[PDB]
């Protein structure tokens, strides 16, 4: 590690990691060797010069974008584009972004419609790759998935989207406890990104595995699993340039003693780059159904509902209406 | 000693600029406490162009280093607020009608705001000390340089250290860098800083434990009260405990009402 002179006194004084070393000071460095401030200066200047870091830029470059290209990020679209204007592009890379509400509220058929925009081609919204779904709950609703597929089929007019096939590149898999669950976030999950191009990581959900465990050395190991889980995520999502998409049950009814709170605490919070809240309301809106060659034969009624951002660093804690529908989740313009 | 030591830098809310003293004082170490969503990189965003400010316009006129440990640096949120700045200058330059606020405003654009925010990105607690120990080299070739923001202090360190002994001189070894730094070349540290738990109704304090804090001259806390932003003067030299009303629009940190919001509250004494 660079030079040995100077290595005489550190490699007999017990502190050989780089990363130990710029933690004392200099006047420390000569208790520890007998070496002066001139080696002591050098010497922590070679070691944090040493450690690979992403390099200088400015706020003009991010916008250009023209710097260090790990520092850019990428919209995934919603395929709604009333959606992506209230997220002001869509789901952003490199970011966690928590998806919370209560029971029928549309996460799990907002993550599946991700699973599908997820492998458009850059120029449509997409980041032309595949997703992993991490199911901890039910079975996945592949019947449901494989109508939304052939919905995207039939309303796209491009040969491009249609010859993509989305049931080949969505990666399934099922996490039943805590420590499964990070061992495929830490294990599995890597292979898809690297092997595979897959561009999107689903949890869902995130907050059903603390399920009911209620042991203080257990709640220590739940709360560890956690952070270790949750830093995974975020490392991921930083180094192959993705989305990280955790859903989580709003926990109602107990700290409301309408209002709600997300489950997992404020450590888990911590990790949350963007968290958006889905809600069900009571109104509901006539549209006509139609089909394809037949037309217009009546209307029917669909659940109008609620997404909420709680907190996000870019966006204002704006509400917006969006349905669920055969085709899958689409805006309402505003408002 | 000099008339550069004593500036503070404007946050845009002048209930804000109270508690503190009149803006971010630098030279000094401020630190920004907060639930998620509070403000916390808003108010870091705010003062990293509201410190590029012409003098002619009552500001320092530098240049800020933005140090992003979470990633959360969205430079399409910087343009919202940078665009709000120019727009609040220009207006002051056609009121006020003076000559040298109209040749500012020839060179004042929401790009140069961009271009003043020099822009640090650490994944872990090692590359920030490495970015701290090469800062003394970076800042002598630009001393232009007024503020330094870290968003955020807490995140690189909230693992799972086998001695937390080694994390405390760890901290104290950084605090005693960014005081060092904030003297040495007249610049204002800003660190934010996340919250968390404490079982032994569960409440919420600042991270990093009892060790952390006494280095920083100015302390806030962010909080939310009924559907309110306020800010909890924590620590500071008056000793007096002040919360104080903001509000977060697009064009950044804002007072609530033009103007409103006072409280009074202390300790001993
Ligand atoms: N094809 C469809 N058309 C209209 N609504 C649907 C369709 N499929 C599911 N839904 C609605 O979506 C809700 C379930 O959404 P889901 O993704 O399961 O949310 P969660 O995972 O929060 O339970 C139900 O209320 C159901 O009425
Ligand atoms: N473009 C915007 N317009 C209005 N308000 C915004 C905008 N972007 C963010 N905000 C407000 O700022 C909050 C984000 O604050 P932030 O500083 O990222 O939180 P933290 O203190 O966790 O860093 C959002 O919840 C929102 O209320
Ligand atoms: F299907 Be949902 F995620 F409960
Ligand atoms: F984006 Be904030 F610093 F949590």
């Known amino acids: 590690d660079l030079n040995p002179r100077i290595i005489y006194s550190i490699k007999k004084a017990h502190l050989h990691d780089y990363g130990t070393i710029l933690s004392l000071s200099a006047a420390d460095i000569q208790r520890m060797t007998r070496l002066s401030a001139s080696d002591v200066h050098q010497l922590q200047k070679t070691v944090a010069e040493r450690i690979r870091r992403t390099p200088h830029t400015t706020a003009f470059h ?217 809600m069900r309301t009571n109104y509901k809106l006539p549209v006509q159904q139609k089909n394809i060659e037949g037309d217009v034969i009546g209307s029917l009624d669909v659940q109008i509902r609620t997404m909420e951002v709680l907190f996000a660093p870019h966006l204002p804690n704006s509400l917006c209406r969006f349905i669920v529908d055969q085709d899958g989740v689409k805006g309402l313009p505003a408002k | 000693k000099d008339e550069r030591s004593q500036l503070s830098i404007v946050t845009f809310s002048e209930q804000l600029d109270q508690i503190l003293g009149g803006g971010v004082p630098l030279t000094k170490i401020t630190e920004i406490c907060g639930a998620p969503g509070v403000g916390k990189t808003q108010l870091s965003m705010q003062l990293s162009v509201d410190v590029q400010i012409p003098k002619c316009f009552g500001g320092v006129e530098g240049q800020a280093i933005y140090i992003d440990t979470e990633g959360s640096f969205i430079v399409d949120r910087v343009v919202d607020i940078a665009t709000a700045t120019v727009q609040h200058c220009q207006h002051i330059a056609s009121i006020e009608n003076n000559a040298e606020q109209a040749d500012s405003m020839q060179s004042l654009t929401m790009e140069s705001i961009l271009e003043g925010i020099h822009y640090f990105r650490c994944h872990d607690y090692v590359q920030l000390l490495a970015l701290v120990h090469t800062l003394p080299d970076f800042l002598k070739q630009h001393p232009q340089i007024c503020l330094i923001v870290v968003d955020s202090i807490a995140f690189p360190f909230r693992h799972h250290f086998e001695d937390y002994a080694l994390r405390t001189r760890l901290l104290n070894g950084l605090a005693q860098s960014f005081i060092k730094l904030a003297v040495d070349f007249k610049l204002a540290v800003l660190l934010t800083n996340q919250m968390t738990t404490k079982i032994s109704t569960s409440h919420l304090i600042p991270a990093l434990g009892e060790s952390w804090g006494h280095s920083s001259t100015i302390r806030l806390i962010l909080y939310w009260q009924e559907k309110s932003r306020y800010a909890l003067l924590y620590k500071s030299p008056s000793h007096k405990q002040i919360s104080v009303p903001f509000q977060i629009t697009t064009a950044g940190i804002r007072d609530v009402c033009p103007t409103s919001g006072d409280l009074i509250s202390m300790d001993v004494g």
């Open chain 1, 62 to 278: 991010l916008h250009r974008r023209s710097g260090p290209a790990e520092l850019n990020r990428d919209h995934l679209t919603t395929g709604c584009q009333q959606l992506d204007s209230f997220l002001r592009g869509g789901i952003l890379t490199r970011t966690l972004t928590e998806i919370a509400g209560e029971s029928a509220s549309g996460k799990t058929q907002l993550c599946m419609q991700l699973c599908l925009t997820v492998q458009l081609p850059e120029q449509m919204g997409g980041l032309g790759g595949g997703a992993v779904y991490i199911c901890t709950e039910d079975v996945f609703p592949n019947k449901r998935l494989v109508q939304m597929i052939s919905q995207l089929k039939q309303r796209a007019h491009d040969v491009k989207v249609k010859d993509i096939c989305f049931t080949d590149n969505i990666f399934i898999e099922h996490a039943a406890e805590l420590d499964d669950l990070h061992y495929c976030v830490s294990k599995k999950v890597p292979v898809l990104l690297a092997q595979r191009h897959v561009k999107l990581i689903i949890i869902d959900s995130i907050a059903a595995l603390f399920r009911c465990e209620h042991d203080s050395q257990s709640l220590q190991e739940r709360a560890r699993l956690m952070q270790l889980i949750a830093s995974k995520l975020l490392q991921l999502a930083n180094q192959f340039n993705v989305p990280a998409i955790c859903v989580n049950q709003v926990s109602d009814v107990v700290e409301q003693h309408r209002k709600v709170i997300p489950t997992l605490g404020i450590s888990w919070a911590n990790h949350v780059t963007v968290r958006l809240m889905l």
